[PDB]
Design an enzyme around this catalytic site. Structure first.
Site, PDB file in Angstrom:
ATOM      1  N   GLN A   1     -22.163  54.420  17.606  1.00  0.00           N
ATOM      2  CA  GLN A   1     -22.829  53.144  17.402  1.00  0.00           C
ATOM      3  C   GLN A   1     -21.970  51.960  17.787  1.00  0.00           C
ATOM      4  O   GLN A   1     -20.695  52.039  17.746  1.00  0.00           O
ATOM      5  CB  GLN A   1     -23.216  53.033  15.931  1.00  0.00           C
ATOM      6  CG  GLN A   1     -22.035  53.332  15.015  1.00  0.00           C
ATOM      7  CD  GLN A   1     -22.315  53.144  13.543  1.00  0.00           C
ATOM      8  OE1 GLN A   1     -23.507  52.864  13.104  1.00  0.00           O
ATOM      9  NE2 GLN A   1     -21.333  53.291  12.802  1.00  0.00           N
TER      10      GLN A   1
ATOM     11  N   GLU B   1     -28.186  46.498   9.037  1.00  0.00           N
ATOM     12  CA  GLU B   1     -27.695  47.227   7.870  1.00  0.00           C
ATOM     13  C   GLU B   1     -26.906  46.431   6.846  1.00  0.00           C
ATOM     14  O   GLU B   1     -26.233  45.412   7.196  1.00  0.00           O
ATOM     15  CB  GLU B   1     -26.828  48.408   8.353  1.00  0.00           C
ATOM     16  CG  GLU B   1     -25.946  49.076   7.264  1.00  0.00           C
ATOM     17  CD  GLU B   1     -25.026  50.183   7.830  1.00  0.00           C
ATOM     18  OE1 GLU B   1     -24.346  50.856   7.024  1.00  0.00           O
ATOM     19  OE2 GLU B   1     -24.972  50.372   9.070  1.00  0.00           O
TER      20      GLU B   1
END
Lengths: 7, 204
Positions: free
Chosen positions: B53, B134
């Site tokens: 990521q 997030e």
């Protein structure tokens, strides 16, 4: 530290 | 109490190759210790062995940072980031143990990338592709204490535009992606939705 983590 | 820490779109499949999109950098508030992050990635949902990521964080004190990570192995901060910048993010998995992460600030012309290889302690399944907002965690040295950072408010919405996912060289549509929202104290704190090649996430 930063735990950017499992869903 | 954070009940759900990811907000965004998650595709489930196999042989995911590359995941990329361009996201805008929002202004954030809520305190110097409040934060949030936007990133694109491979795995980490139904594949719990690893995640490739890359993305950026915003803190309530108006600061930012960029990073890349091949969890659990290589994790690190990458480029300068300011409110309003347009950031192209991308990861590629050439195999379950090799790939790359690239972060490009299209507004400043800066670009960083990291190539990964022989990733042992954690390989990819290449079964999840995602665009996520997030509420991340902050842990002490030995993982004995990990906690979610207070979630910053942000504005305007963080939008992943020109989203692109490929599986075996073939592009995959966002049509059937599962949607998740960040939820704290039994309340949705994001409204992420999909439309065409755009994943748009508003703070709530």
């Amino acid at each position: 530290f930063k735990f950017x983590a499992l869903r | 109490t954070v009940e759900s820490n990811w907000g965004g779109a998650i595709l489930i499949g196999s042989d995911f190759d590359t995941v990329s999109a361009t996201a805008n950098v929002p202004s954030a508030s809520g305190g110097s210790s409040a934060a949030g992050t936007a990133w694109v990635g491979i795995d980490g949902d139904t594949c719990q062995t690893a995640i490739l990521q890359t993305g950026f964080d915003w803190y309530g004190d108006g600061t930012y940072d960029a990073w890349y990570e091949w969890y659990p192995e290589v994790s690190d901060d990458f480029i300068t980031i300011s409110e309003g910048d347009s950031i192209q993010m991308s990861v590629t998995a050439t195999s379950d143990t090799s790939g790359s992460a690239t972060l490009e600030n299209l507004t400043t012309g800066q670009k960083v990338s990291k190539s990964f290889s022989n990733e042992s302690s954690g390989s990819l399944c290449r079964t999840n592709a995602e665009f996520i907002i997030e509420d991340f965690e902050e842990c002490n040295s030995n993982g004995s204490d990990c906690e979610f950072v207070p979630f910053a408010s942000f504005s305007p919405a963080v939008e992943f535009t020109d989203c692109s996912v490929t599986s075996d060289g073939e592009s995959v549509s966002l049509d059937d992606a599962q949607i998740t929202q960040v939820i704290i104290n039994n309340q949705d704190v994001t409204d992420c939705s999909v439309s065409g090649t755009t994943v748009s996430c508003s703070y709530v």
